[PDB]
Amino acid sequence: PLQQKLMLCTLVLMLRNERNKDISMGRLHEVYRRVCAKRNILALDQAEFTGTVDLVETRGILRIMRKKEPRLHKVLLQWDEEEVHAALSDKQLIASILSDTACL
Amino acid sequence: TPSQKMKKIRAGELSPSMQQRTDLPAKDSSKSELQLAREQLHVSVVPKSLPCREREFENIYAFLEGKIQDQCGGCMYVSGVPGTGKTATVTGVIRTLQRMAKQNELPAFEYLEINGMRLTEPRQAYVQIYKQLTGKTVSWEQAHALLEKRFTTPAPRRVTTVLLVDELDILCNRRQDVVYNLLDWPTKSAAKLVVVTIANTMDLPERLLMGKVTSRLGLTRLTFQPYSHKQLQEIVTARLGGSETFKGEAVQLVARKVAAVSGDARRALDICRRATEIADTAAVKCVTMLHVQQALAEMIASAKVQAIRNCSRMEQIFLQAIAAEVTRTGVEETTFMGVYQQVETIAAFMGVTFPPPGRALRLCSKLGAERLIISEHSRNDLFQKILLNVSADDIHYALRV
Amino acid sequence: MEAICSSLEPLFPCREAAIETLGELIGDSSETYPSAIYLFGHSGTGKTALTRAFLKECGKRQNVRTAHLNAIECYTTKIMLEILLDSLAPDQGDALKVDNMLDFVEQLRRQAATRVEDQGFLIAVDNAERLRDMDANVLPVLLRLQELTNLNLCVILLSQLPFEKFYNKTGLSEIVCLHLAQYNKAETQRILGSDFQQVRNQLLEQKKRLEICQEAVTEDFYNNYLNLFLSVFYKACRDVPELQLTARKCLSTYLEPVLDGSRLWRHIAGPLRSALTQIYMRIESLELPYYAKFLLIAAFLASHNAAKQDKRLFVKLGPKSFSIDRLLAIFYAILEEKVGLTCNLLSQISTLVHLNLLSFVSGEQNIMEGSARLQCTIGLEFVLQIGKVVGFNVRQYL
Amino acid sequence: PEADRELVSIRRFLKERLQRDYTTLRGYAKERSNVRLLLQRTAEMGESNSLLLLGPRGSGKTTLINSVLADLLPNKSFGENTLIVHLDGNLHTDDRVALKSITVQMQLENAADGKVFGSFAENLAFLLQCLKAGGKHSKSVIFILEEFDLFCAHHNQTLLYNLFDVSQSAQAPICVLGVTCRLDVIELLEKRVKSRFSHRQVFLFPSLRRFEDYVDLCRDLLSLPTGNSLLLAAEKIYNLQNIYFSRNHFDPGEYGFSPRLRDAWNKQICKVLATQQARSTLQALHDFDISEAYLKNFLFRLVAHLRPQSPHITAEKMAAVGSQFEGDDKIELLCGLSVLELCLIIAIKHHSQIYDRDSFNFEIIYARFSKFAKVSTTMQAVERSIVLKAFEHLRIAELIMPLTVQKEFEMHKLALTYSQIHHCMQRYQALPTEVAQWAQS
Amino acid sequence: RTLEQLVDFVVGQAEREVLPTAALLTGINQPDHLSQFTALTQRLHAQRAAMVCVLQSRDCATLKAAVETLVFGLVEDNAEVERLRRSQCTMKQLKSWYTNNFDSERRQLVVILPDFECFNASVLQDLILILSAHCGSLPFVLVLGVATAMTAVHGTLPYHVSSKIRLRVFQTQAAPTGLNEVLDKVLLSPKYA
């Protein structure tokens, strides 16, 4: 699904650009909304974004460490980016997201 | 006396009836065509032959037919994201096998089934499997002992038994005794059990099952991929029949905006029903594309900007000052004291007075009950921590445009 | 609603506004009640006695069923529900049984009757600050018990805290806040002077002194004495029961020159400034064994002298932590007699710990492993008194 | 006196309307129409639906559900072909309590006079077997789960997974209907439970963000209705009582005002609400919280003050209740303290202003107080024990809170802004001038 | 002598809100005083003036356990003067038992607390507030056993708790005086060989 592709590309971008791999669901969603705004496509709300990240979690691509609140849950990537790039199979899009440093 | 009722219930000798309607259900011929599409589009109406799941049907059918005809037993693990036609395909394969065994083209077989979320405890599956055999309700220890006496001991003429197990991850727990028994019974030669296990996560045997349980679960596996842009259109146009009550672009927009989110088929069959209900109140008989756009905007809702615009003016000043303190201090978690100081600054700018802090705690409690912000219990005032739950740009989008 | 306020006002001087507000909100039982009322104030403000007298007068005069509670008593919610339904469902006997919050709501729903009889219910919960420390579904249900039970009941709550302390993460229903202000000096003088006939009768039952008192114990005399008492005692406390229980003893000292033949203020102002130092103490030298005295002053030096100064004092913020071996080392350094390490000495260490003369700031689980940390908890003047009785001059080592 | 009793009838009427009007619903046309057509399709056509009422606390969600049920129940079709199961998240704190309540309210064979037999597992198995045994010929259940977000917190969300799954299955036509205040309740759900949920959602934001709607609401809440409206309202309430709140509802036929009395009352209400003072009080009240429960609380405190000597509402009465609402309640506690505790709070404010909100201690505050008390020429006589009991009196009012060790050395935090202590310095009665000078420096 | 003064204090409360309470400044030698409190229970039972519970610190780690041992001690002490489970001995059951028995006649409900220094502070303050809540309905008397001094009583009782206390101080004789009395009248007696 396209929203799962955008979520995986923003997670790969935030993991590449930042030394601190403590990514929260809210800190990821705030970048994902800016990426969807620059792609000129409608973004999901946080209540749907949490279910989208939970559906990506079933594939084993991620692991969510639960916390007291849904915004505070910690996404943790469990594939290397060289596997994530071959899994997304949309290199023209990942080349656009990973060259989009200004939206972080 | 109640004890005779409970004994007749636990012995299974009274069927659990439900009360019937006083009035008869309405006849089919009085229905409108749009109502006929609304009832064909219900998610409970499983088709007799599922569109776009033929390959998985051949896979589960070849596995179950080989395990039944060889009289050997074994296990399978099917998995996939919810709404992708797992349980419907497995029950369709089992109904096809029962229709074939009824005509003596196949050996006869028993079909037990359980579900891991209908059980309060993992061990209660022992109560239920035995309840699909004898029909008696007994304690789980006696049921486990009778199930071991049934499966470990060769008793011709034993018939093949297929134990479908939905919701396998709920049955796990720490000891993993129940799933070990359910996967260890097929390995014995005396039991002809063929257990199929449905679950969501692809990596479940490696993620949370033990090494011997994963070794018993085997390497035969099947994954139900999410429905694409096209398969979701084929499903809904199969549900509608030959009716033209839905525009083809409307079904195409439903499928295009549902497959981009999840690939769930229940979301498409619910959005099409809501589009039918929206077209019904407009007194049109065709579901034109703007009815689908309204149903999509309703069922993929994003109503937080409406909540910030509908807040009282002091709550809007509070929502501005929390984001102002987040921008000022940098860290995302703010104490109530600096939030109140920024509140006094913004209220001095706008000219309205602000309520004293005992009423500002009532405003913070209202925003924390509405989940616009995350906030602690109010007993530790001025030092309670106030996370902002809504994004900071949504507040300016609500209070500017 | 008029008869209740008329019957409570003589008992409660300077509370006509609070009694008027309570008799407007929950006076008449035929009128519907607010869903919850929260009156609050300081200690001594008279809220427990006011809600008790109000609930008693409403239950005697009208059809209401009253239930008073103390929320400290309800360590579990089942205790509160059983007492609340023992009072709101009278004469149920020992057959009464409440499992949870749902059974309480159902059995209170059974108590509804016809509108002709105009019945009402009232629930007062004193010490309501404890309601936020328990099951976190008791307080939200208590603030909407009227909507839940479909029944004409108000849930009064009583605490020393504002309702801003009571909000939780899930929010709360509306409540009618009410404030019991503490009295100023004039209303406190009117309250202390409102019991004048009782103390006058108490003197007249207790014989030249009887006529010389009854000819000179009139209302202006008690008012001038209460002015002389509140001129010194109002600075320390506004607490009305404490002012009563001190003012009676101070009158018992004050009255003597009148019985024995201004011209009074200095003779009482001697003792009156002595009673001011004994305020809050409600009253109507620690002998120790010798080696326990040396152990206690050694623990005081261990907690008062810091770890670095022992090497300079003995080789020959808060109180500091000290390990037990540091205590034994300072004890052997100050002892200058060297007794053996018998069982009785370490037993004295443990029984000084048990008397709260020492404390366990940490450790606890491993006293014997040497990881335990003790902390001396006495003042310096007791140590100087022990050093006077012993003959060990403590101030040399400080 | 007749005029003494008409005011008592008006006051009992207005109080009973502000407290017990469980079915009247102002506003929400399309949302109530959605809920009503959904329950009507579940009762008639046998469709298995689900719904989730959402919105801020104080908006009419429970009142909307009671209005829809009150207009659907006396139809003698919805009442005969549909049984209703209320559940509440505050009372049903565990899945087994909610399950025994479901078994009682559906009148299942194992219930028998309100005492369900069997275990939690046997109750779940008998309930699911009764629901699987039904069909379109069986009666429709309508579950109504108030405080749905607390039902999301139960173990495995297991009851929720059953209640949605019957709605997803060809069994008994049930209609799950959550009602909750959280706007993000749907991300609390497990992905299986979220999949079986039908994502239709009804947000009930109040329609009176405009001030003129708030003034019209406050006018309609105080006006006496026309008597033919009392006849139609009593007719509808009698229709819902011939067949739950109906034992103690409004019943507006008990009160029947004369036309001159209703005319004089509505004239006085319009004249009061046309004034600038009452509009300024309602403007401050609307600026704080717009929700109707807040206005009904203010109006109950207003209507409760109608003594026979003063029949009329006036703008000064609304201004008095509004001045009661807006006042800080910690300054009113600080003014009740004796001068010793006020000197202790002034020493705490000095230690906080100097050390920039560092945590203090009883010893530091007693030293800072004694440095003033040695030259105060009125505070020389206090013992250390009296200052310690005054510090504990500050601590039990939660004007001082522990950082979460001896009681005299425990660290603490002031729970006050400096402006609250500064307004206590002006509101205090009979403050000695030495303390008023020491507070400035 | 101190026994007669304590018994007169309990009977004077029986002749008659704050709970009356009697601090007893006893010595450091805590085990010896159980015979003193036992003699107090023997005198109060012999006069039929009161019924006595004794609250050891080992039995009262929490407020629930303190209330359970208090009610269980009062009911079983009355049963022993002339067995419910400890889960159900609520203070409401104590009020119902006192109304079923002694409302027709008033026995005091003395609650000895021999080891006052060993108590948890929060449990003791909550118990004093609970016993003060029931005054008038249930006549409580709270004698104590303070091994140290009255400054410990004024320290562990806060402003709110001491607002509901009307304590009176009795003093047991010093331990060295008792040693000197035993050594002169027993170990130096002519009559022992």
Add this chain to the structure above:
DNA sequence: AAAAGCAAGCATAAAAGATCTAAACATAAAATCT
């Protein structure tokens, strides 16, 4: 130059916080005694 004194660093451990489970407690089915 000798031994007490301030940053550094990993480490047992301590809070905690959810979480799962074992035993104590309430309770129902049932042989047993009358």
Add this chain to the structure above:
DNA sequence: AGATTTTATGTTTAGATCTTTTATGCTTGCTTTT
């Protein structure tokens, strides 16, 4: 054909467990006064 332990069972609460996170303390590595 009815009362009594007897026993098997389900619930609930206290304790074991998993996990994060935070901290004092154990040791180190300089650091610096006498």
